[PDB]
């Protein structure tokens, strides 16, 4: 049947995202984004205070490493060899994961700077009906959430917003062209992170 108007849905998702404290996130990098050596990540994030835990697949020196990670008390830790925790210092010197849910600079700021929104279709994301929406995100909003994009123009993007219910952002993708793109799927909004 007919699609809703994207614009009110984006506005509603913006407000919902600003109110978020925590979520489960799955992040995938498709192709190659210069200065991003991550391939995948899956984890749980809470904010105020910031903590995160999960697993990451990343490339270091031409090799893919699977690692568990914890961010706790500003500090990033990861197991670059199995069951061995290394301390990598302040998480903020690499990337503070709270930035993803910062209401001024994170996903909500992406949504508020998502231009030309148009509903394209319906898709299931994690068992929920969502509206797939195309648009373009400002360079400045992209660079603030994902510095390695190094955008000097608007970035084509797709968002998937819950059709009913709370209208959360279920998924977002930023396309750097060719077959190079970053996507995040969010779920379990307001989960207790558990702790670390
Ligand atoms: C809608 C889309 C939403 C997108 C939201 C998030 C987008 C991603 C944010 C961009 C990350 C920017 C961080 C710098 C990029 C980096 O990779 O450095 C490149 C250097 C090579 O680049 C350079 O040459 C120099 C950069 C200096 C980096 C120093 C590295 C020190 C080595 C030790 C790190 C190993 C532990 C990492 C475990 C995570 O080699 C490295 O890869 C080593 C560092 C790996 C960092 C992984 C960052 C994790 C992203 C977390 C956000 C996801 C949400 C979290 C939810 C829980």
Residue numbers in the entry: 36 to 231
List passages from the publication reporting this PDB structure.
Previous work on the structure of LprG revealed a large central cavity that can accommodate triacylated lipid species, including triacylated phosphatidylinositol (Ac1PIM2). Briefly, the alpha-beta fold is maintained and consists of 10 anti-parallel ß-strands apposed by 6 α-helices that define a central cavity whose entrance is lined by multiple loops. The TAG glyceryl group is located at this entrance between loops L1 (aa 65–72) and L2 (aa 95–98). Compared to the position of Ac1PIM2 bound to LprG, the orientation of TAG is conserved: the hydrophilic glyceryl headgroup interacts with Ser72 at the cavity entrance. The acyl chains form interactions with the side chains of hydrophobic residues within the cavity. However, while the three acyl chains of Ac1PIM2 are all bound within the cavity, only two of the TAG palmitoyl chains (sn1 and sn2) are similarly buried; the third acyl chain (sn3) is exposed to the solvent. The first ten carbons of the sn3 palmitoyl chain form van der Waals contacts with the hydrophobic sidechains at the cavity entrance, including Leu95, Leu115, Phe123 and Ile129. The lid of the cavity, composed of a helix-loop motif (α2-loop1- α3-loop2), is flexible and was found in two conformations that define distinct cavity volumes. The volume of the open form with TAG bound is 1425 Å3 and the closed form is 895 Å3 due to a major inward movement of the cavity lid (aa 129–134). Comparing the helix-loop motif in the closed and open forms, the side chain of Tyr130 blocks the binding site for the sn2-palmitoyl chain of TAG.
